[PDB]
Amino acid sequence: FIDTNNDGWIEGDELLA
Numbered sequence: 001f002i003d004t005n006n007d008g009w010i011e012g013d014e015l016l017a
């Protein structure tokens, strides 16, 4: 996955990556 808001968690659009 790729974390697009750089928070350290995988959530939203990040889960389809």
Ligand SMILES: [Lu+3]
Pocket (backbone or CB within 6 Å): 003, 004, 005, 006, 007, 008, 009, 010, 011, 014
């Ligand atoms: Lu995130």
